[PDB]
Amino acid sequence: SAGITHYIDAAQITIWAFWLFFFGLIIYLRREDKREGYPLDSDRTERSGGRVKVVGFPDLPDPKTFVLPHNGGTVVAPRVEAPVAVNATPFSPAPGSPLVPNGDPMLSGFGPAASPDRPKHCDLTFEGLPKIVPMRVAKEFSIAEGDPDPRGMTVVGLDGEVAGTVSDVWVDRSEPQIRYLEVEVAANKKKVLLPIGFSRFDKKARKVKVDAIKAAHFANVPTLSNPDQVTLYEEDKVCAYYAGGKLYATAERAGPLL
Template identity: 45%
Template sequence: MVGVEFFGNTDLASIAIWLFWIFFAGLVYYLQTENMREGYPLRDDGDGVPANESLFPLPKEKTFILRDGKGTLTVPSRDYEDSKMRTDLALAQSSPSTGSPWLPTGDPMVDGVGPAAWAPRRDAPELDAHGHVKIKPMSMLPDFKISAGRDPRGKAVVGGDGEVVGRVTDMWVDVPEALVRYMTVDLNPEGSGKTRLIPINMARILPDRVKVKSLKAGNWDNVPATKSMEQVTLLEEDKITAYYAGGTLYAS
């Protein structure tokens, strides 16, 4: 028999389970180090690398070729992290001790700090698998129509204080997903063209109006605008959604 003549008293089941645990530990190590390609090296409050950065060492630099001719990206890299950092934050440390909270020194919704913080993403629109812009106004998509639910177009927009601030004029659709992402609100009912985007998740479409609870009447003028009314960039999306989300705490 194989178990007697070749392996003798060796416990094959024990070897198998130990090989599995060694493989699993190696897998955890690999996944954790690969996960450290973005956001590392870490920084402490003095803009230095903290002593207890991680239990795992940083992986070696690796260069990735980006799709759609957007060049290459090498991570982890201090230069890359420096280029992504926001250095103009309107914040002040509440105490000298490391890890103490940072407090806003201005209008946190406008400054984009705290719950209203945004990340410096690429200032280019998100593309689908074929290299086409994903999110477009429905007015530019003749093949799209409302098949279910309430159509918000033409409805008045009110904030958390109940004040009417404008009217919905269009919706923006994630074309590959066939999903509404934003609504366009004209802040002047007369149609002055002063428009802003409302994230669909931050609004409630009622039978007679669209309600955005997180903003009050005095907050709408400062909603980040888009450079184009035909597309929205990743950076603009982050700023817009952060402004509405931050209003939940800061608008009042």
């Protein structure tokens, strides 16, 4: 790696042989690292790097072609995606600064609650049935011999107050497991789905603790179109709503601690 060389040998004739392949592979990768996102949006802080450049060190790659399975469309990577929308205003005219959520941040659909418009279709299994469905349809699925049953437990909330009770849980045909919980909100008496990721258990009191949002927030949760299957579009917009709680369910959360 020295600037000047006075020594030559086979050992070193192969080392550089690697770095070249390396410097090349790292680029190969970078190219791929841009099949989702780029180009960038603004110029808040002029692309930083040993060598600036227009759009990174490596020019964007060629659109790959993804043939979804039967009864499916087609995806291209990368792809020219139409600009999204921001339901928030700039906390400051200075670039980089954050964007304050308008109205109730719990549903402003921004940041934590913000979710992209995923395909308004539904994921399926190998054969063609909706991958993720409620046990009210999964005639084969049963609770593991021994493990306590969730169906019937009362879903508590952040503040502690009860928000509703589980009426059913959504299992996954493709990958045997519990992914959602058909929760029955008390307030709106509606039926919203609850994601495992946020679903906590207290087998002692037959509950499904949730620190995401308050019991009251469970009310206006992104409803589902068909109660016999969850759409990818909504599915992602579902558990995203809970995320908001992770940062909006309480002014204290977003507020500093020190």
